[PDB]
């Protein structure tokens, strides 16, 4: 059950480029496939969903230029990128969207493309000693009930689901990771920072289009 995605490289502005993303354990036409990019210096940014039934959506800053599609024959999601510009420089991940029932739990590896309701998170940056207890917060402008997830992304590696549905822990995640909240305020607690836990953490709303918060970075 992987997502291996392929293709990228450089391209001068105006050019076009077609990312792909082949899956193994999941069926591409049966899931909500989606693309997220992280601009250098910025945080995670949703690009475009494709529904199992064929509907397609995109973020404002790419609509008309990008075209998500898939080929059921070879089980592969594609992202068709035309009229590219410098702001489209980012690491481009493909992710399976379980939505409100599981977040984006299965991510591909990045493919660096090099062109030549507000979610809030606090702290923006925090240092903590190993074995400390760390609580980061996330805030919603409109009440989203408990429909919100958390992800760790360590520098260079693809993101990773932690909590979805405000409090449900993703299978395969250390028990020290825990989370609570409903309405507009949400928290993630790490009970005892172990050295691997040093990364940046986002929240995301699981109702709307995927909308990630700014991100809180943990470090020493």
């Amino acid at each position: 059950v992987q997502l291996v995605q392929s293709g990228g490289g450089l391209i001068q502005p105006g050019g076009s480029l077609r990312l792909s993303c082949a899956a193994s354990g999941v069926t591409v036409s049966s899931n909500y496939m989606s693309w997220v990019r992280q601009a250098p210096g910025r945080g995670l940014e949703w690009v475009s969903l494709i529904y199992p039934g064929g509907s397609t959506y995109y973020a404002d800053s790419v609509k008309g230029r990008f075209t998500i599609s898939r080929d059921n024959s070879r089980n592969t999601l594609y992202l068709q990128m035309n009229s590219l510009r410098a702001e489209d420089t980012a690491v481009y991940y493909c992710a399976r969207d379980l939505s409100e029932k599981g977040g984006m739990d299965v991510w591909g590896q990045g493919t660096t493309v090099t062109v030549s309701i507000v979610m809030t998170q606090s702290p923006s940056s925090l240092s903590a000693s190993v074995g400390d207890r760390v609580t980061i917060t996330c805030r919603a402008s409109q009440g989203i009930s408990s429909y919100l997830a958390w992800y760790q992304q360590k520098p260079g590696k693809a993101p990773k689901l932690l909590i979805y549905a405000a409090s449900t822990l993703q299978s395969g995640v250390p028990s020290r990771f825990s989370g609570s909240g409903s309405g507009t305020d949400f928290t993630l607690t790490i009970s005892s920072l172990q050295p691997e836990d040093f990364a940046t953490y986002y929240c995301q709303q699981l109702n709307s289009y995927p909308r990630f918060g700014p991100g809180t970075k943990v470090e020493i």
């Binding site: 493919t111 260079g156 590696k157």
Partner: protein, 176 residues
């Protein structure tokens, strides 16, 4: 436990004129490390699916940014024609990542070279490490540098300030 990570994480890569083929045999390794280090600016697989890998040649060289597109089936240019040719029916995967921080230096790094002058295009997977004075003119060179008598190699001059297409990229080609 194949040494894929000896190729990738070599502390030094080579030049495209003199690329290194490392034959891997007597082993079994997953190609997990390819699709698990998200930090590759390019990963293309031809003739195969990159999921269907786990159920024999590693070639490593350094080129600049806007010519990694040449390290692919059917592409042509100063690299595909005279340095590293890859056939039109390739069965393998092309892996490339920016190496600015490692193959560049202030005032320019002229340690990586490529073949500028060659009379005919290379055959696929062919290699040419010849240093014979290329005759451009009508007069014989007798192996002596000068006018119309050129050392067929050329330095990259990788500087950190270079534009992104002129930055050094490390390329790994796994042919099956």
């Amino acid at each position: 436990l194949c040494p894929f990570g000896e190729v990738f994480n070599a502390t030094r890569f080579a030049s495209v004129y003199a690329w290194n083929r490392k034959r891997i045999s007597n082993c079994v390794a997953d190609y997990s490390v390819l699709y698990n280090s998200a930090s590759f600016s390019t990963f293309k697989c031809y003739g195969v699916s990159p999921t269907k890998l786990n159920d024999v040649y590693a070639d490593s060289f350094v080129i600049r940014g806007d010519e990694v597109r040449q390290i692919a089936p059917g592409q042509t240019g100063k690299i595909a024609d005279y340095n590293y040719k890859l056939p039109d029916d390739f069965t393998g995967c092309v892996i490339a990542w920016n190496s600015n921080n490692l193959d560049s230096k202030v005032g320019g790094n002229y340690n990586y070279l490529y073949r500028l002058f060659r009379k005919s295009n290379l055959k696929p997977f062919e290699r040419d490490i010849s240093t014979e004075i290329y005759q451009a003119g009508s007069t014989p060179c007798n192996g002596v540098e000068g006018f119309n008598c050129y050392f067929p190699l050329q330095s990259y001059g990788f500087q950190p300030t270079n534009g992104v297409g002129y930055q050094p990229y490390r390329v790994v080609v796994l042919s099956f």
